[PDB]
């Protein structure tokens, strides 16, 4: 019974460790801003937003670096070990920074503008965030690769099911983390929240350690990035250790896979910016009220339960989506290619953003009637509209369906078409391109923030009343449509190369 034992226990352990790691990551990034803006660091809100954006970007852009450092000589198991160790170290060091003793011992003393580094304990916190992001990205990439290695040849449909329940466990960890950790952080001292975070991290590390006799591995592969870029140049340059045949094969497969992820970059940009603007729009609705009643205990809504609702919408779909649709399409034999499933996901995303633009048009026309209403989520009061947050539920359902249909075939394709060696490398490159799209969308929002722009309401202390985001929604829709067209073209090209 040993075979099935090790297989299923390894799958379950990988799922649980990824769940705990994503939980820790979400628990951190949900209230990193509030932690920075606390009375113990005196950081400015602009600096906190910059730190959060740079943290996300650094994580996403260091994912490929960590995956490559793994795949070159480090090995997936040892890389997960060291990355979880670095994650635990960063979490514990941040926990000690929370304590006044560690705070004064590590980065000087509390001081007696912009990039001048006037915020207290700037360099130490920046290095901590960089190391934590690198560790989280390495864990994510190498653990996805390891779980796919586990759910290898025994079943390909089993591999698809594995990616499905993998995203499901990610969403479950996200839900648990958001709810519990955010409640603890904004209602009790941050010490308890970060302590339970570092405890979850240590528990996940110990589970991974225990799983060692169960987890299976392979010898380290080669094809360093030096030789990779050298052959790429040689193929590309005019006059201005594996075998070379294996390096050429890896280069060819990389050339094949690159356009797909490059065309996926705009989709990830649109998705991240759409999630952000959806949170922003839901913020300005009539969110239901718990016993706090905010008359101008357990008050200060955790500001992250909208993301919790979104992740819950994404979650519920996954099991029913799989169980119904996959056997259904299998028996109906109208089964499309993974690229066409991504196209269907992009179409569902276009539908969701159109519905969101219409909903925002209704919201703005309702505000035009001057039927304002106050509400205070977090530490920032916002004026809202008489509309209800329950109208955001259909568009959240649509965007969740889109996200699932795009993401599951995404990683499925990314792993399957990749060669056994370059699996984690292409996973890391996929994460890097997703993060590059996210950063490009943030930069586009920054350019739109320019005076005379669609989003230029400064005096509104950061409320979307005077700002006009309907045009922004329509532009996102158009960009998504163009991206879908280009993706169909790249998919046809990839199919023609596949038959080649």
Can you tell me about this structure?
The protein has 500 residues and is an all-alpha fold. The protein folds into two domains: 1-215, MFS general substrate transporter like domains (Growth Hormone, Chain: A), CATH 1.20.1250; 223-500, Growth Hormone, Chain: A (Up-down Bundle), CATH 1.20.1250. Helix content is 74%, strand content 2%. The protein has 14 helices and two strands; from the N terminus they run αααααααααααββααα. The chain has helices at residues 2-36, 45-74, 76-98, 100-106, 122-150, 156-187, 190-210, 225-236, 244-283, 305-332, 338-368, 392-416, 423-448, 470-499; strands at residues 373-377, 380-384. The chain has a two-stranded antiparallel ribbon with strand order 1-2. The chain is globular. The PDB classes it as membrane protein. Keywords: Transporter, membrane protein.
Structure in a nutshell:
This protein has 500 residues and is an all-alpha fold.
């Amino acid at each position: 019974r040993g075979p099935r034992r090790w297989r299923r226990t390894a799958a379950a352990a990988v799922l649980l460790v990824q769940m705990l790691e994503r939980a820790a990551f979400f628990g951190v990034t949900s209230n990193l801003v509030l932690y920075l803006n606390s009375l113990n660091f005196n950081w400015d809100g602009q600096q906190a937003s910059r730190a959060t954006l740079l943290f996300l970007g650094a994580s996403y852009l260091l994912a490929p670096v960590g995956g490559w450092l793994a795949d070159v000589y480090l090995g997936r198991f040892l890389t997960i070990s060291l990355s979880l160790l670095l994650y635990l170290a960063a979490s514990g060091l941040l926990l000690t920074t929370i304590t006044n003793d560690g705070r004064r011992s590590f980065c000087g003393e509390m001081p007696e503008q912009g990039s001048w580094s006037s915020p207290y304990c700037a360099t130490t916190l920046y290095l901590v965030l960089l190391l934590l992001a690198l560790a989280a990205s390495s864990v994510r990439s190498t653990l996805t690769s390891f779980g796919a290695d586990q759910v290898m040849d025994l079943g390909r449909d089993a591999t698809r099911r594995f990616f499905n329940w993998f995203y499901w466990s990610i969403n479950l960890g996200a839900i648990l983390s958001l709810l519990v950790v955010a409640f603890i952080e904004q209602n009790i001292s941050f010490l308890w929240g970060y302590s339970i975070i570092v405890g979850l991290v240590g528990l996940a590390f110990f589970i991974f350690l225990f799983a060692t006799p169960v987890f299976i591995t392979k010898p380290p592969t080669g094809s360093q990035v030096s030789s990779m870029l050298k052959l790429a140049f040689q193929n590309c340059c005019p006059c201005r250790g594996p075998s070379p045949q294996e390096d050429m094969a890896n280069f060819q497969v990389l050339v094949k896979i690159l356009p797909v992820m490059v065309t996926l970059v705009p989709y990830w940009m649109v998705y991240f910016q759409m999630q952000s603007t959806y949170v922003l729009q839901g913020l300005h609705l009539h969110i239901p009220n718990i016993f706090r009643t905010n008359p101008n205990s357990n008050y200060r809504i955790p500001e992250a339960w909208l993301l919790l609702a979104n992740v819950a919408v994404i979650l519920i779909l996954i099991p029913v989506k799989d169980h119904l649709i996959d056997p259904l399409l299998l028996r109906c034999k109208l089964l499309p290619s993974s690229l066409q499933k991504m196209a269907l996901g992009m179409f569902f995303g276009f539908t969701s953003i159109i519905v969101a633009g219409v909903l925002e048009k209704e919201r703005l026309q309702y505000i035009a009637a001057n039927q304002t209403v106050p509400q205070l989520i977090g530490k920032d009061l916002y004026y809202a509209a008489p509309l209800s947050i329950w109208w955001q539920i259909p568009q959240y359902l649509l965007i969740g369906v889109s996200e699932i249909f795009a993401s599951i075939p995404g990683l499925e394709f990314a792993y399957s078409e990749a060669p056994r060696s370059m699996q984690g490398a292409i996973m890391g490159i996929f994460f890097c391109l997703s993060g590059v799209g996210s950063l490009l969308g943030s930069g586009l929002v920054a350019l739109l923030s320019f005076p005379g722009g669609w989003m230029y309401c400064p005096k509104d202390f950061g409320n979307i009343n005077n700002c006009q985001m309907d045009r922004y929604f329509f532009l996102l829709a158009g960009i998504e449509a163009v991206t879908a067209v280009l993706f169909l073209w790249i998919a046809g090209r990839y199919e023609r190369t596949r038959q080649d």
